[PDB]
């Protein structure tokens, strides 16, 4: 392996030699430089004008090793910045890599899959350009087998990852017919036993559901919700994360779409999610809760039935502030859409004190959200003649002192809502 630690100059020398073997070893030397951890000299390789050469090498059917070496080299260049990815595309790599997907050498088709994943991963324009060149059909053909388990683990992982990049990004979202075409294969990958394939399949589904309800509907109608819910309960954090994101995405949609998440048993996992030691899981889970409490009354009722109100009190009592912010949103939504009975239950679970404590916060929006919530709870207290008991409760936990101080707040939505609450209930 005397292709170790070459200069760029020597690589250029060998590549310009018109000796295919000399080209092969110089290309391998480039692969090695480009596959090093510390500052691989991507720009120096680009400046030397090597990309068109590498691309031409992809087409050398008669010399498989150089196809492999250049595929690897181009992969690592395309993994760089957008400008570096663009240089690979500008050299015509896209159709060349797509032709390689049909190679008889698995390590070469795999390397093409990888490279296309890096190009598509750059953003929506390159994603859509890879689609226009017709990548999807030969990619899906690689997975047209009776049992995915007969495929090499690394190979299957690379294919899944690349497919997820075709599902990825917005402005614009991927073409509808593309998504339609990829979906049945994704649904199948979502049922595979490998933790990495599972994660990346979940990421893919998370991307597709990040948008307008019509995108969400395409996914929901495939029947993947129960499987997403199952994956929500996995032990592996890299599976739970994209599974939770996808579920969160779906409940931003219609009441009907939100009902399928509930019907699939999602709420039963929330006691763990809302107490998860990973901050981002707890925050995402609480956000999802807030969008569920923005649903119908019967859906608020299922939140109650699953014992999730005390978990919301817990999150409101102690959590990362951004999670507490989502919890406040969850409560205001609850108190806006809930019945009198459901609102009363909330107080009985102890919502008032941690609510009042967050009034000291240095964020204007959560103050607004909270003041709205207590306003809604008073409006429920009226229909019971028990507004007096609530005033005292709020006075006792030091809440009234907090609301008085808000009458002289910078913001105006704030100082009004405060004084408003004061003159109606505390006078």
């Amino acid at each position: 392996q005397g292709t170790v630690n070459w200069s760029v100059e020597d690589i250029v020398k060998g590549i310009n030699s018109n000796n295919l073997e000399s080209q092969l070893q110089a290309t391998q030397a480039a692969r090695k430089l480009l596959s090093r951890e510390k500052q691989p000299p991507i720009d120096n390789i680009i400046r030397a004008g090597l990309i068109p050469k590498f691309v031409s090498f992809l087409g050398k059917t008669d010399c498989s090793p150089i196809q492999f070496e250049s595929a690897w080299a181009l992969t690592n260049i395309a993994s760089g910045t957008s400008e570096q990815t663009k240089a690979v595309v500008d050299g015509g790599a896209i159709p060349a890599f797509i032709s390689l997907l049909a190679s008889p050498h698995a390590h070469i088709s795999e390397q093409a899959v990888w490279a296309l994943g890096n190009i598509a991963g750059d953003g929506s324009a390159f994603r859509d350009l890879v689609i226009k060149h017709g990548a999807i059909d030969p990619l899906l053909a690689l997975l047209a087998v009776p049992d995915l388990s007969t495929l090499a683990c690394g190979y299957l992982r690379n294919l899944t990852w690349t497919l997820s990049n075709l599902c990825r990004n917005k402005n614009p979202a991927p073409p509808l017919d593309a998504v339609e075409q990829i979906l049945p294969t994704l649904v199948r990958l979502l049922h595979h036993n490998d933790p990495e394939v599972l994660a990346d399949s979940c990421w893919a589904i998370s991307y597709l559901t990040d948008g307008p309800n019509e995108r969400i509907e395409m996914v929901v109608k495939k029947g993947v919700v129960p499987q997403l819910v199952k994956l929500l309960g996995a032990t592996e954090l890299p599976i739970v994360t994209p599974a939770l994101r996808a579920i969160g995405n779906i409940v931003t949609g219609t009441d009907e779409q939100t009902q399928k998440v509930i019907d699939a048993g999602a709420l039963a996992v929330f006691p763990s999610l809302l107490t998860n030691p990973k901050t981002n899981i707890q925050k995402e889970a609480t956000w999802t809760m807030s969008n569920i409490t923005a649903g119908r009354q019967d859906q608020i009722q299922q939140v109650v039935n699953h014992g999730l109100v005390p978990f919301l009190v817990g999150v409101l009592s102690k959590a990362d502030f951004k999670t507490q912010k989502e919890a406040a949103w969850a409560i205001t939504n609850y108190t806006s859409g809930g019945t009198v009975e459901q609102i009363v239950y909330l107080v009985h679970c102890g919502i008032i004190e941690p609510l009042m404590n967050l009034l000291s916060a240095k964020d204007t929006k959560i103050i607004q959200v909270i003041l709205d919530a207590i306003s809604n709870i008073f409006q429920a207290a009226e229909k019971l003649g028990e507004t007096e008991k609530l005033s005292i409760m709020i006075e006792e936990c030091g809440g009234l002192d907090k609301i008085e101080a808000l009458q002289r707040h910078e913001n105006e939505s704030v100082y009004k809502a405060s004084l408003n609450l004061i003159e109606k209930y505390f006078s």
């Binding site: 090695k32 990888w114 990049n165």
Partner: peptide, 12 residues
């Protein structure tokens, strides 16, 4: 936490 959009193939 996040799936990377690009991935280099490292040396063995």
């Amino acid at each position: 936490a996040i799936s990377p959009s690009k991935r280099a193939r490292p040396a063995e």
